[PDB]
Amino acid sequence: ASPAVRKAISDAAQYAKPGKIFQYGTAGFRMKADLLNTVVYAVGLLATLRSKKLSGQWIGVMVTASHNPAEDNGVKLVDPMGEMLEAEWEAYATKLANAPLEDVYDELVKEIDVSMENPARVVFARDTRASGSRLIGVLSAALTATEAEFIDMKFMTTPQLHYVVRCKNTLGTQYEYGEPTEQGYYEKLAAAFKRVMRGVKVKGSLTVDCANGVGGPKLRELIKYLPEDTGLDIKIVNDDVINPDSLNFECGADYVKTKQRAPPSSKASILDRCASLDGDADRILYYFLDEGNVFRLLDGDRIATLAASFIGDLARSAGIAQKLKIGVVQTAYANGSSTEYIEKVLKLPSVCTNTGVKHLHHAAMRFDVGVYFEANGHGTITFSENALKTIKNTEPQSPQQRSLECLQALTDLINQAVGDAISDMLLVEAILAHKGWTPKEWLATYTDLPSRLVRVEVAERSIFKAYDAERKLESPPGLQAKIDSLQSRYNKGRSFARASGTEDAVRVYAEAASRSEADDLATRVANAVRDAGT
Ligand SMILES: CC(=O)N[C@@H]1[C@@H](O)[C@H](O)[C@@H](COP(=O)(O)O)O[C@@H]1O
Ligand SMILES: [Mg+2]
């Protein structure tokens, strides 16, 4: 590598230790913010290595703990196309975080064949967290020691940062993603939303809970750029970004999804169309209060079916339904009714994949148009190289033209790099405008099987080894046989159990034709899992 550089890395590394042991995973490095200096430093070094390995391409760093409380923070790497860090590279981060101050960077330059000829290039941003300023200061020191070029994008949503990274590495290519600034992002979405909305009108207000996080001021700033006669009026609530303690506190998409209620502080009336973003605004879900005051959730799987229905219809009327392979990508947690709706009502393939955004993104990129959402409200619609060409180059034999126009627009509206709450929100709004649907008519599209999720503490969960999109247990022996036996005893009975990646428990999900059936099925399986976890 270099000797004078290797002395600057060792010297600047001055920070803690702090003796806990780390692992970069699904969520990158994510912990209490006080444990994090040596780790963010290491990611500075790892961003440098990654940039150089990929011929001095821009690598992103996002500083965020997402839905976690204020005391928490995290750090994530973004690869050139705006994808999360390639899986094989997570271990490199791990080695660098644990490995003691004083150098070891050098050992990886040899191991990963990395060219010194290019300077590393790295963009970063952060959410509203209290530790962000100091953590960025750390990141800067690591990128000064390795003589990397870097740009501080300051405060951004997670999807904005991914946007920038994609833009920077696609400028001058055939598939230019846009202007690599915050301004660029808003401009792209506003112009796409004007096109997608041509001749159609939003009805009623949308009350968006912004989790008191970065998504609130960024949404408000996007609203300045949006066009005029769309009918869209957004009411922003929970934007107390000023107070670090307010982040994700009894509001946000994660609260609303996991607790199955509107935020306590919500002032929405009966029939007000509502949504919640998470803290870093890459998760959204809709909800409304019944004509009879019952809370009604329209989660990621519900956005997935809404999107697929709309995209299905457009591809048809655009005359390209046959040329392009369209699909919905789901996990096992997707309500069986959602799957049934996709396959029997929309006549589209559903692919079930492992839990984890990587796996859903990967499966979606196998369709020309791949809709993938998790229930928690993370997801997007993937457009393939092939999809983009045939939308841009099919000649309309009918005024079809309108539909192609609408579809081209959608490719610009829908964030391709990462699932994006603000993007998804405008998507939903555009769909319900085009379809002329209320929240009530969206909900009425099919009925969810009553379902139950349970968290089952065992010691230890590593004996729970699954396959077939995590819908079957190979280990421990006999448990799947019991689970299969149990589910049969109930009408439309479906249940599966898997180790959590993020928590120390196995999760049981169950659904059946009725509330008491689902509940009892879930409990029997939970009991069976506890016995098997002894
Ligand atoms: C960025 C990413 O890949 N996130 C995944 C998410 O896709 C998955 O739904 C969740 C499942 O959690 P679990 O293993 O505890 O059920 O874990 C992670 O947060
Ligand atoms: Mg998030």
Among the listed residues 221, 427, 225, 393, the one whose alpha carbon sits nearest the alpha carbon of residue 308 = 427
| DSSP annotation of 28 | B
* 509 shares a domain with 457: yes
- For residue 467, the one-letter residue type is Y
Q: How far apart are CA 214 and CA 238, in angstroms?
A: 11
Indicate whether 290 and 348 sit together in one domain. yes
Residue with token string 């993370």: 378
Is residue 350 part of the annotated active site? The answer reads: no
Residues 112 and 183 in one domain: no
Q: Provide the b/e sequence for 324-350 (b: ≥16 CB within 10 Å).
A: bbbbbbbbbbbbbbbbebbeeebebeb
CB 72 within 8 A of CB 32: yes
Which two tokens mark 127? 């959410």
8 Å CB contact between 450 and 517: yes
User: Which ligand neighbours the alpha carbon of 470 most closely?
Assistant: 1
Atom nearest to 502 CA in ligand 1: 15
Q: Residue 66 Cα, ligand 2 centroid: separation in angstroms?
A: 4
Closest C-alpha residue for ligand 1 atom 10 = 356
Which has the closest alpha carbon to 112: 26, 57, 46?
A: 46
Q: What angle do CA 530, 330, 385 make, to 5 degrees?
A: 150
Determine whether the shortest distance from the Cβ of 258 to ligand 1 is under 6 A: no
Q: Which residues pair with 30 in a beta bridge?
A: 74
What residues contact residue 384 under an 8 Å CB cut-off, 6+ apart? Answer: 365, 367, 368, 369, 370
Residues 415 and 503 in one domain: no
The finding on whether 25 has its CB within 6 A of some atom of ligand 1 is no
> Three-state SS for 218?
helix
Distance CA 154, CA 55 (A): 25
Burial (CB count <10 Å: 0-12, 13-18, 19+), residue 82 = buried
What is the CA angle 82-60-422, rounded to 5? 55
Q: Which long-range contacts (CB under 8 A, 24 or more apart) does 38-42 make?
A: 38/13, 38/97, 38/101, 39/75, 39/97, 40/75, 40/135, 40/138, 40/139, 40/142, 41/12, 41/13, 41/15, 41/138, 41/139, 41/141, 41/142, 42/93, 42/96, 42/97, 42/142
Are residues 326 and 183 part of one domain? yes
Same domain, 263 and 289: yes
What is the distance between the alpha carbons of residues 157 and 161, in angstroms, rounded to a whole number?
A: 7
Q: Please state the separation of Cα 431 from the chain's center in Å.
A: 20
- Tell me the residue range of the domain where 91 lies: 1-175
Q: 381 with 457, same domain?
A: no
Q: From the CB of residue 515, how many other CB atoms can be counted at a distance below 10 Å?
A: 12
SS3 readout for 108-177:
HHHHCCCCCCCCCEEEEEECCCCCHHHHHHHHHHHHHHCCCEEEEEEECCHHHHHHHHHHHHHCCCCCCC
- By three-state DSSP, how is residue 273 classified? strand
Last residue of a domain, one of 160, 175, 190: 175
Pocket flag, ligand 1, residue 501 (CB < 6 Å): yes
Residue ending a domain, choose from 134, 160, 175: 175
Residues 330 and 462 in one domain: no
Regarding the beta carbon of 65 and ligand 1, being less than 6 Å apart is answered no
Tell me the best of 354, 355, 380 to mutate to test the pocket of ligand 1, counting ligand atoms within 8 Å of each CB and taking the most: 355
Which of 175, 201, 232 finishes a domain?
175
Q: Which two tokens stand for residue 383?
A: 């457009």
Using CA atoms, how far apart are residues 131 and 12, in angstroms rounded to an integer?
A: 19
Supply the angle between the helices 37-53 and 90-98 in degrees, to the nearest 10: 140
Which one of the listed residues 66, 131, 350, 403 is annotated catalytic? 66
Cα 128-132-138 angle, rounded to 5 deg = 165
What the block records as the tokens of 10 is: 């060792």
Q: What's the resolution in A?
A: 2.3
Burial zone of 178 (CB within 10 Å; 0-12 exposed, 13-18 middle, 19+ buried): buried
Pocket test for ligand 1, best of 329, 357, 453 (most atoms within 8 A of CB): 357
Same structural domain, 241 and 109: no
How many domains, the chain? Answer: 3
Shared domain for 186 and 319, answered yes or no, is yes
Residues 413 and 497 in one domain: no
Per-position DSSP letters for 181-192, written without gaps between them: SHHHHHHHHHHH
What's the 159 CA to ligand 2 centre distance in angstroms?
Answer: 9
DSSP string, 61-127: EEE--TTS-TTEEEEEEE-TTSPBPPGGGHHHHHHHHHS-----HHHHHHHTT--TTS--EEEEEE-
Say whether both 533 and 410 belong to one domain. Answer: no
